[PDB]
Each structure stands twice: as C-alpha cells, then as structure tokens.
Paper text:
Chaperonins are essential protein-folding machines, classified into three structural and phylogenetic groups: Group I (bacterial GroEL), Group II (archaeal thermosome and eukaryotic CCT), and Group III (bacterial thermosome-like). All chaperonin monomers share a common three-domain structure: an apical domain involved in substrate recognition, an equatorial domain containing the ATP-binding site that drives the conformational changes that occur during the chaperonin functional cycle, and an intermediate domain linking the two by relaying signals. Using ancestral sequence reconstruction (ASR) and protein resurrection, we inferred and experimentally characterized the last common ancestors of these groups (ancestral chaperonins ACI, ACII, and ACIII). We selected several AC nodes for protein synthesis and purification, including the last common ancestors of Group I (ACI), Group II (ACII), and Group III (ACIII), along with the ancestor of the Fibrobacteres–Chlorobi–Bacteroidetes (FCB) Group (AFCB).
Finally, our structural characterization of AFCB (Ancestral FCB Chaperonin) revealed a strikingly modern architecture. There was no need for the addition of ATP to generate a stable, homogeneous population of double-ring oligomers. ACIII assembled as eight-subunit double rings without ATP-Mg²+, and AFCB formed 7-subunit double rings. Unsurprisingly, AFCB closely resembles E. coli GroEL, sharing a 71% sequence identity. Although resurrecting the GroES-type cochaperonin was beyond the scope of this study, an analysis of key residues involved in the GroEL-GroES interaction showed that all three essential residues are conserved in AFCB. This strongly suggests that AFCB likely interacts with a GroES-type cochaperonin, hinting at the co-evolution of the chaperonin and its cochaperonin counterpart within the FCB lineage. We selected the FCB group as a more modern ancestor reference because of its well-definition in the phylogenetic tree, and because of its peculiarity of encoding a putative archaeal pathway for ether-bound isoprenoid membrane lipids besides the bacterial fatty acid membrane pathway, that support the hypothesis that LUCA possessed a heterochiral “mixed archaeal/bacterial membrane”, possibly a remnant from before bacteria and archaea diverged. The Group III chaperonin from C. hydrogenoformans, a thermophile, showed the highest rate of ATP hydrolysis, followed by AFCB. AFCB and ACIII showed similar patterns, with a small initial increase in LDH activity before stabilizing at ∼75% activity after 35 min. Tracking these probabilities across nodes revealed dynamic shifts: residues that potentially prevent double-ring formation in ACI gradually gave way to substitutions that favor stable double-ring interfaces.
Numbering used by the authors:
A (entry chain N), B (entry chain M), C (entry chain C): 2 to 523
D (entry chain B): 450 to 523
Write the structure that this text describes.
C-alpha cells in the first residue's frame, strides 16, 4: 500500500517537516549560538553547537514530514563547506523562502511564476555577490585569511600560506596525523584523481567519511573484474605481505565485490577498490603514468599479463592513500625519480609536438597533475588529543582557505546577503507574481542575520535595520556586539554563501512546484 | 475470504482508484509540469517530472481502488513510446472519459450505447488524425524531426538521419556505449526476431528492463529442453571458457529453467535463453540462417548431433547480444562473409524460382531481415556520466524518429487532439445515448490541452477557446507562450497520440461496462 | 435565526420533499388507484382515493422538504378542475421532470438551457394538444360529454345540456340545494362578477370554501368604508330584521373589518363583504346597474345620500349569494321586470350611439351579463344524503362540461400526453442541453399513464409501448383492460391536461434554477 | 461580470477576456448572448454603480481593519 497526498495538504506537510528540521538546526547558528542535546543508544548525552551534527540525527515519524526533512537535509548539504554555517545558512534560507512562497501562493499566486522570479532574483543576487567579493591573491593576505580561519593562531596561518605558495593554487595539499612533536612541511610527488570508492563499506574513518590505507599495494589493471576465481594469488600474497592492497580496476562488480566486502568487514584483509582514473586511450595513458609513479607495472592484455600473473615486483607501492567519496589521494609514490623527470620531459616533448587545443589543454592538465606534486604537512604538538584537535583545525583552515582563494571573500555573519540585496532594488519580473517572488527572496536574504542575533537574544529588527542603513562592509559583529567588520575579520568565503543561497533557492523551487506526494503505509 | 461489490458501488470504487492514479500522474504533463517526490525504502527521496516513474509507484490500500489503478496503469502502459507524454496522455484521457461516463450513466444512460458511441467517435477521430498527420520522407526532414526530438542538437540529428538512410526505413538501429571520444557509425551483419527471455527474473540491466550479454556463446538447438541430465558438459565448457552463453531451443521449461535461474541468481554463470525463430520448415531454415550468420552449426536429431556432442567449434559467437521482453538483437556474428553473401545469392535464386505469393513474401522478408544487417551507432563523448545521459538522449531520439517515420507527425501539446474534434461535429449515433458518448469523448480531447496549461497555472478556458478559433497547426507553445506551432518545433508522432487515444477508449469502455469487482480480504 | 443552504444540496432537499409529496399523492391516480389512510385528531381515521384531499394534509418535519412540497402544492392547486386527476397529474409530471432534471444537472447540464428546452417542448406539446382536441359545439355531444362526466346516467346529462343550451356559453349556472323531490330547472335574473370575499373568515361552507347568505340584504355604496362609527344604524336594523347582509362598497379595511369579523365569528350578525365590480367610472355605472337589478338604490354623495340615514327601502333583496374566493353570484334580484328590460333597451340605445370599438365590446359584455340572467338547477331526489351526493355529482359535472366546451376533449388516462409526444420527435434546441431538456420532458409525458397502470399492479413498459405503437385515440382503459378510447367514454378535458402540463413545467423551471433556500430554525 | 455570466451557466473566463479585449462600450449582453452594448439598450446609471463601488470599498476597508468583535452570549 502507499499513501498519497495532493496539492495544499502535501505542501503543508512538507512545510511542517522542513520547519521541524529548521528549528532543530537554526538555533546553532553563529558565534553566540544555542546548544542541542542528542540521545544516543547506550551512551551519555552529547551536546552540539554545530549545525551539521544536529542535522544528521533528524528523522521524523510521519513519512511526509520525514521526506521534507531529508529533502532539505540533502540539498542543503551539497555545499562544499563542512566546518559550519554552510549547511545551516542554506537550511534557514530554505525554510524562509519555502514558508513565504507556500503561504503566499495559498493567497492566489502562480507557483511557476513564483519559481521563475525566485530564480531570476537568485541570479541577480549571485551576480552582485560576485561583484562584491574582495579577491585574495598573495602570501600576506592568504596568511591573513587562514588566521581568520584558524581561530587567530598565526603559526598555522603562516604554515598553510607558505604551503599553498609552494604547491600552487590549483595544487593539492593534504594533512595527516604525525608521530613527532614539531610541525613541518614537505612537498612530495603523487596523484589525486576524482574517482572514489565503489561501495561505502570500506570507510575506516567513519568520523570523516574516509578510508585510509598505510603502505599499500597498488595493482595497475586495465580490464574488468567480475569473477572471484581469478584474483586468488594476489590476495594470498597480500595477506602474506601483511600490508593493505588498493584495487584500481576498470569495473569491479558482482561476486568479486561481495567477496572483498566480506573479507574487509571481517577484518581479515585490509583492501579497498576505486574506479580507474581517465577515459579510454587516455585512461591507458594516465594508468601507465601512475604505474611509473608508484613504481609498479601495468597488468593488461595488450602486453599479455593475466590478472594472476601479478606479483610483489609488479605491484605498485606508496606510503599513504585516502579514499574519500569523490576523489582519492596518492602521496609519495615509491618510484625512482629519474624516470619521473623522464616522464615530464616526454610530456613537454608532447607539448611542443601537439597542435590541437583540446590535446594541449588535457595534457597540460596531466603535466600539472604529475609534476605539480603533493604538499604534505607533518602537524605535531605536545599531547595526542591536542594534536588531534590541531589537525582538525588544520583541515578546517585548509578547506576555508581553498574556498577563499577560489572565489574571494565576503563580509560574513549574515551581512553579505544584506549587502547583496541592493541589486534587488529596481528589478521587476515579467508579471506581478515574479515581483512577489523577488520580494520573497529579498525578505529571505536577511533571515541569517535575524536568527544569528535572535540566538543572542537581542531584538533583531533594530540591528538588521541599522545594518541596512550602512554601506560597504559595515555590519554586526555578533561576538563582541560592535559595528565594524572591515578588518575585524569575521568573514566567510564568497563561494560558501553563494552555493548555500543557490541550494536554498533550488530546494525552494522544487518544493513550491510539488502537488503530489507518495509514501508507504507502515 | 472475498469482498464483492456490484454495480454503482463497484464502478465508484473504480472511479476513485483511477482518479487517484490520474491525479498522481496528471501533475507531470507538458513542459511546464510540476514535481512529484517519491521515497525509496532506503536512502534519499527522489524528485521526478515524467509520468512513467510516478505511474510505477502507485499501489493503494483499498483493494478495489488498487485494482482500478493497476488496470489503467497496465492498459495505459501499452503505448510503444517510453520517453513521456504517451502514458500520461492515455491516463489523462482515460480518467476524463471514465469520469464523464459514470457521471452521465448516473442520469440513466445505457452503458453499452455509451461504449459504442465512444468507440465509433474514436474511430472517426483516428481517421481524421491519420488524414491530418504530415508525412516525413527525406533525409533533411528526418534530420529536422530528430533535432526536434533531441532538444535542438544538430549533430545527433545528422547522425540518426544518416543511419536511417543507410539502413532503411524498416531497418534496425542499435546504440552502444563506446569507449572512444568520437561517435562513429558502422554497418555490420546481425539479426533480430520478435521473441525475448523466458523469465522476468533474468534481467541484468533492471533500469530499462532489458538483459544484455557481452561476447557470448550461441548454441543452436532444434528440440525442447526439459531436464538437467542432458546439458551438463556444455555448461561446464562454457564456464571454463568464462564467457556468457545464449541458448536457442524450441522451448525451455522445468528443471532446466530452474537450474538456469539458480546459476544466474547465484552469479556462477552468465547464460541466456530465447525461443526458436520461425515455424516448421521456416524454423529449420531460419535457424540455419542464424547459425551461418554467427559462424556456428545447428544441433538436431535429423542430422545426428546430440546436445552433449556440441563443443566450442560448433558453438556460435558474437560480441553484443541484447534481450528484452519482446524482441532481441544480434550484432556482428563471427562468421565468414563469403558464406553470408552466398546465402543471400541462394535466397534470391529461390526468389526467382518460387511462384506462390505467400512463400514469395516470406522469402522477401527473410532476405531483408538477413542481408540488411544491423546499424551500429557507437555513442562516444568526453566524460562517463555525460556520455551516459547522451546515450539515453539518442535512444529516446531513435524511438521518436522511428515512430515519426512510421506514421507521420502532428502538432504537439494536445493540439492534435483538439483539431481532430472537427470530425465529430456531424457524427451521430443510432440512438441518443451514442450521441451522448460522442459528446463525452469530444469533451475529453481538450482535457490533455487543459491540463498542460493547468500545470502552467493559467486558465485553460481562454487558451482552448482561442486555439479552437484557429485552424491548421495554430497552437499553444507552453514553453514560450506564443501562439505558433507550425515551424516552432514542438510536436509528437501521430502514432503515439493514436495509440494513447485508442488505449484510453479501450479502458473507458471496459470500465463503463463493469458492474462486478472481486478482491480478497487482507 | 434562519438556516441557509445553497448549491445542489438545497435542490436535493427540495427534490426529497417533492418525492415525499408525490409518493403520498401519486398512488391515488387512475380509475383503480389505491387508498391513502390519514391521521384524524378526533374520531376515526379517514380513507380517500381522491388525491386533492391527500395533498391538503401533507407537511413534513425537515423544513427544506416541507418547502419543496408546499411549492408543488401551490403551483398544482391552480388547475381549473377540482373533481380529480388535475392536481395529481400535475404533481406526477412535476416529480418526473424535476427528478430527471436534477439527474441531468448533476450529469453536467446548464440549468438555464434545460429550463428553456422544457419551456419550448411544453409549448410544442400544448400546440399538439390544441391540434388533437375534438371540439364540442352542439347540444347532442354536450349531452354525451355530460353523461360521461356523471358516471353514465343520461338524466343529469340531458338536464345540464338543456341548462347550457338556455344560459349561453359565457352564461353562468349554479347548483341549488332543492327541497322538492323532483329536479327542476329555472332561468332567472342574476349577476356575476369576479370579486370574492375580503377575508377567509367569512366562509360558511368550508367544504367547498364558499359563503352563502340566504335571502340577504344588499347595499350599493360608492365611497370607501374604514371605521365603525358610520355603519351603526344599518347593522342595527339588519339584526332587527333577522336576515343576512351583503356588503358591496369600494373598500373595507381596518376597524370596520375588525367589527364585522367580530360580529360574524360570534354569530351575532351574519354578513359578507365584497368589493364593487369594475373600475372607476365603470364602477359607478355597474354599481348602478346592480342597484337596479336588486331593486335597491345607490348610496353616493353625488346624489346626496349618506349611509347613516339609509333605510330598508333603499336596500336590495335577493335569494342566494354564493361568496367564494374569487367570484360572487346574484340570483333573482327582487326588481320589477319592466325596469330591467327597459335598462336593457337603454344599453342597446348606447350600443348604437357609441362609435369606438372598445366601448362597444364593453357595452356588449354589460348587456350579456345583465340580460343574460343566471340559470339555476334545483336538484331533487328522495332522501337527504342521496340528494347531497347528487348535488356533488352535478357540481363535478358542471365543472367538467364547462372546461370541455372551453377547450374541447382529448383521450384520458394519459393517452393524450402520450400521443402529444409525437411533436417532440423533430424538435431540437440551439444547443445540446436544450435537446436534453426536450428528451427529459418527453420521458416525463409517459409518467401519468405509467403510474395509472402501475397502480393497477401491471407492468408499465408493455402497456405504454403498446399504446405508443397505436395512433389516434387508441389507448388503454384500465377500468376494463381493453384497448379503445374513441367511444369507450373515458376522456378528460383538454384544458385540464394542458393546465396540468404547463403548471408542472413551470414548477420544474423554478426548481431546477434554484441555488439558495432560506428556512426558519424551529 | 463573472457572476452575471456564471448565473447563465457559461464559463466566465472566456467572456471576460474577450470583453476586456474590446474598447469603448463593447460588452456582453446576457439576455441575447451577443457582443455589442452601444445601442443595444442595456444601460445602468453611473450613479448606482459608482455608489456601489464606493460602498464596497468602504465596507472592505472597515472589515479589514477590525481586530475584535464583541458579541453577547445567547
């Protein structure tokens, strides 16, 4: 059986679910935010002042409210930032826009024209957000934005600024737990390709949704993997080696996947599988390049090596690898460097050889991918737990600084969306309903400030009004209850605010244009 | 343990079920439709904008309503097109006609006369629709209709136009996931006959309800297969070979099918089985034809070969074999080309020799279905996921172009059904109740147009009146809201509209003349 | 505090009330109808096969149904005939038309078009009945029709035939309760004008709703009477005389009416009041004519006569004055015959003198009513109850024959309405709903005969078809179960059928086009 | 206009759109269902419709701007 709700009843149930998730999450917004307690099975109370954590333990009894909750949760979480105020800002914006849109279109508006107006004004406000952002490019200012990112600790800001200078803007920087007491920085060779694991049952660091293998074995394979019968000796010699093996194959599926899941869950064998990087003839190209990186050899039928022919000598070796959901990192592939610079030489020989722009672009990407290198930081401090907290801080600073160099910075604390609303002053849609949608999103842009100061328990209207009278970077610093942000340095990357607003507009559009809902009866 | 309802109670239960299904499907219609949110048992909620997926997720609690919903879903699913607006329009028309039919028979009308009137007016509307559809005949206009089908992309338009002129009007196209970055076209030998798999548990790609093999083995058999004891070594040598297996036999049933299902579901073996193509002497001849196409040999008691005696040498080989419910395709059978052209020459020799027209026609269709070959559209693009949706787009374009060349094209958006109402102006039945049925099906032809514009949020009355005031292909472009459809390039094949209206009439008549419904006690 | 109900719910309540009334009443229709027991507060319960008595005792609990029943009662009661089969036929036709009309309005029909179609169709049926009616202009066939209306005893038939033959068509006949055993007929001087009593508290014979004054005194007043103080001497001398008084004046209202009502209800003074005949100058002239007719004198200020000084000599003298709701008869005004014939001579002197045709027509009307006289039939028999029963029989015969010569005669038993359905075969309105209304009333014309035969316990479809295949006056006679009505002597006047059908169509028109009913909460 | 044309059982939107397209005294004659009103002779004084519109605006404003209704218990 399946329950079905149509039109206003369905939309109201979805609004109820989204409102419940909002009031669950919106309270933990800002510096002076509230705290939410969690009941966990066979454990103590745990409180959380971060909106990402409180979101994930939301699941409602009523199926309709539940789908609304999971809808806003998923579309809101597509933003890049995970440190904070990325999944909460989007959620409060989504609640605001959805509430006003549904509760106006109940008063006789056209939902589709409302969605059109919402999208138009979101385009206008993201354009203004791009215009407003101050770019960051240079050592002193990336150090400054890192320090603002790292809770005002100059040394981590200096370290990360230096690192992103060494490797390059588009380059890759990774952090890892160290054994020493000092903090230092090296840049090694390595690869990172945007193909993650094949199933989620390899995550070792469940706290961070990543799987890590130490001193692994890398099999460079080109063909498919379907059958259990053919990969026995590799697994046996890996178990006899007592080290992990990471599987890079064309397509692992079926009984092979079932068997490796079984032995991974049982813990007998530390194994992980990822999709093969590249595409086609260039899949073969980057596969043989990463083979010569890691020091192994390719296993492919064009050179007459069956899968079971692979041995210790043919396998590829490195030190550390991380398998996140999207990408995968290879750092310091244990291979002789002379052939690596020979690879780079033949790469530039290809540069001067080729003629077509598509070839030039893709192989310049390859050059940056191999010769660019991997920045590694040996974060270290006095005690273990403080070192864990320090590496967490380094990771958050890395993400924030990467976003800042990507698309500038904006005055944070909810005032960026205030100053971005100036572009909505003299914009009129094709009809009255689109102007209504423009007004709705204009009213919704200021809700982060309203709630960031409502969490502080002050009157919101006075502060938002006298923030609106200002211009430039004038705004409310919620931490100190002052009225400057230019250099006060409570800032957010423009990218996180832009994508939070875009996601909120998207989910509001998909939610205002729904008049049918389908759920199971328990 | 059964509940039986009679007469108006049963018909009202059917009306309630069909109304729920249609309202669930009516929402997603036209280019300005609205969303529907459906959860899966595990994971994210899913948003949809086509009626097909929403149709597949309807199943109600009251058994009578569920029964009516399944009824209309099944008969509405019989339209050949699967892209969209074929099953949605069928459900819309069926709900409209059924509603008005019950809502008129409450006034004392005779349901038999209503059914006869609906059928007669539907036949007249089909005749007018056929007279209205413009023919498509020429590579240029085939390219145009392909481009309109493919969201205004000329490269696919020229691709399918070239393929269609190369293979022929009744020829066969097959789309495959290339490994290369360029989309090329080839003409290769192959086969196709209208019979599929013997069990619904045998689908590999459940996304499109179709099973597929890659580089299989083809055995040719003449008799039945019933038991396990007679087909051990063929399966053993296949499993040692490590390739999939296609099976052609007279009929497979019983323990053989049971063991095949076990070995497939367990994943030990890749196998397939479809029925024999032809009949009598024609079965023997066409079996020999597929055998000499694929390079194998026939197995039969007439020539003294036992199924166990078959070996690798006798087996047939191919590269891509596709099995769906109705048909199946063989491409590039590994055979010697000289023997195939010799077969063609012997076929035409018999064509000159034969005299009877029936055997003549059988020979011409055999010659066409053998010598024509299989076109191979190798769909290549840059990345993987964009290539995959590209493959989906060209599959949809292939189906749409095939329908358009089959039975012409007409204005889309429901305008074709509007313009066909001119034929029913002077069509009167034998009695008054048939005239009421004619009026009933007249009033339903504008319901599709009324709902494409009702999802747009505008009053359907003005647009339908003002398009009735027009003539020819004057129509409502729901995308851009101007009033030209002649060259504007929003259309539908006349075949899909014809089939949708006919299926709607069939279910309308079958529900109108229903007065007893039997279901079980939960 | 008043309840309000709109839309189809109010019409459903009205239909329920009409259904209750019709089911109470329609069982009595026909020659062999059924019985309707009714509750009597004091004494035995009453049984009646006569529908008008059954109709008068209908009043339901839920006010909307009472409201609907009362509307049908009020419309149907306006039929000229009171003997029977006039109100019941109208009720049955209204039931059929209203039920079919609601079922078709719920089918999706415009009530405006349905009402207009019913009006057009009933006009067509009225024209057909006009065409089909056999005229009665002649002494012999009025004798036959009188015999039919009197249950086949020729004596009363020839009596009323001669009474007509003397009195004239527009001339007026009354029934007098005779004292002698023999039945005698007299043509005497009398008067008639259509002005009834001023209040219903004047009725003496409530069985027929008419007030009778035996040998009364009549005064002829020209001015207005309002209050008590002027009329003391007149009622003083009248009470001293011990005979009734007939009040003819311009208008009586207020304290004067209160006084005469008071002394009437107590029985102290037996009196009756009716307005003067004509208008203005015509009132004065015709008041003076009735004054000469009754032997009295006018009481006008023009001749300097007050009312207080009026004496018995100025009063008029007659024998009987039947005061009903609308008419009032004078018989044998005690006036010297020479004077009235001289006044007739003066009327003819005025007829030749005047030139205008309008005044000529009114003077001819004056001559006809004055010189025409009033025929009186003295009905006599042996016993008491037999003589009153014969009085009732002749009263019914008088009404029946009057209507019959008014508009002819047609076949009875609903056959006239059946054969009148031939006209509606080729009548089509401007649009479909009008044709639906035409069909609705065509089915409704079948209902009188269908109920007539259903009360006989037979099957309606067989007889209604077998009557329809016939032509002319071929029809079903339920008294003897034969199939001829030409000379079988079961007919009804065309006037009663026409009036019943028109009244039924009118009530249907008012009821189908109602969308709010406002009632009183108990 | 929607209610006068809906009391006749006709769909209001088409009539109101196609009379709004007209200019001047072009109008819908409900008695005859024709589309001219200049000399056809269905006229209302400007005073009656003016005062009707004034009173409608007044009652609407006075009912919108009302927060509490004070009524006796039966």
């Amino acid at each position: 059986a399946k329950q079905i709700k149509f039109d206003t009843d369905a939309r109201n149930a979805l609004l109820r679910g989204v409102d419940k998730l909002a009031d669950a999450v919106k309270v933990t917004l800002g510096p002076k935010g509230r705290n939410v307690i969690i009941e966990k099975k066979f454990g103590a109370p745990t409180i959380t002042k971060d909106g990402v954590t409180v979101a994930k333990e939301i699941e409602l009894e009523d199926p309709f409210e539940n789908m609304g909750a999971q809808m806003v949760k998923e579309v809101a979480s597509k933003t890049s930032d995970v440190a904070g105020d990325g999944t909460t800002t989007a959620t409060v914006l989504a609640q605001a826009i959805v509430r006003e849109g549904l509760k106006n279109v109940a008063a006789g508006a056209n939902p589709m024209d409302l969605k059109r107006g919402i999208d138009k004004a979101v385009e206008a406000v993201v354009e203004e957000l791009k215009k407003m952002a101050k770019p960051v490019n240079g050592k002193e200012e990336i150090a400054q934005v890192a320090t603002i990112s790292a809770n005002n600790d100059p040394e981590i800001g200096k370290l990360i600024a230096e690192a992103m200078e060494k490797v390059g803007k588009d380059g890759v920087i990774t952090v890892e737990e160290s054994k020493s007491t000092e903090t230092t920085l090296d840049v090694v060779e390595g690869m990172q390709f945007d193909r993650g694991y094949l199933s989620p049952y390899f995550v070792t660091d469940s706290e961070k949704m990543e799987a890590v293998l130490e001193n692994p074995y890398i099999l460079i394979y080109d063909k498919k993997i379907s059958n259990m019968k053919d990969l026995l000796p590799i697994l046996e010699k890996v178990a006899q080696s007592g080290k992990p093996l990471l599987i890079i194959a064309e397509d692992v599926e079926g009984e092979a996947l079932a068997t490796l899941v079984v032995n991974k869950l049982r813990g007998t064998l530390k194994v992980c599988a990822v999709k093969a990087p590249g595409f086609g003839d260039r899949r073969k190209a980057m596969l043989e390049d990463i083979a010569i990186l890691t020091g192994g050899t390719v296993i492919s039928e064009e050179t007459g090596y069956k899968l079971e022919n692979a041995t210790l000598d043919y396998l590829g070796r490195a030190k550390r690898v991380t398998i996140d959901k999207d990408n995968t990192t290879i750092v310091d592939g244990a291979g002789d460097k002379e052939d690596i610079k020979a690879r780079v030489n033949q790469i530039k020989k290809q540069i001067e050889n080729t003629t077509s722009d598509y070839d030039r672009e893709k192989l310049q990407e390859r050059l940056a991918k191999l010769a660019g290198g991997v920045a590694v930081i040996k974060v270290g401090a006095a005690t273990e737990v403080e070192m864990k907290e320090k590496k967490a801080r380094v990771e958050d600073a890395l993400h924030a600084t990467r976003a800042a160099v990507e698309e500038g910075i904006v005055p944070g604390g909810g005032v960026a969306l205030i100053r971005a609303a100036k572009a909505l002053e003299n914009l009129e849609g094709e009809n009255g309903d689109q102007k209504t949608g423009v007004k709705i999103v204009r009213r919704a842009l200021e809700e982060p400030l309203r709630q960031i100061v409502a969490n502080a328990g002050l009157e919101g209207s006075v502060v938002v009004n006298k923030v609106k009278e200002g211009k430039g970077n004038f705004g409310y610093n919620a931490r100190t209850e002052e009225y400057d942000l230019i250099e006060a340095g409570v800032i957010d990357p423009a990218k996180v605010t832009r994508t939070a607003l875009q996601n909120a507009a998207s989910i509001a559009g998909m939610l205002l244009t729904t008049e049918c809902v389908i759920t199971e009866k328990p």
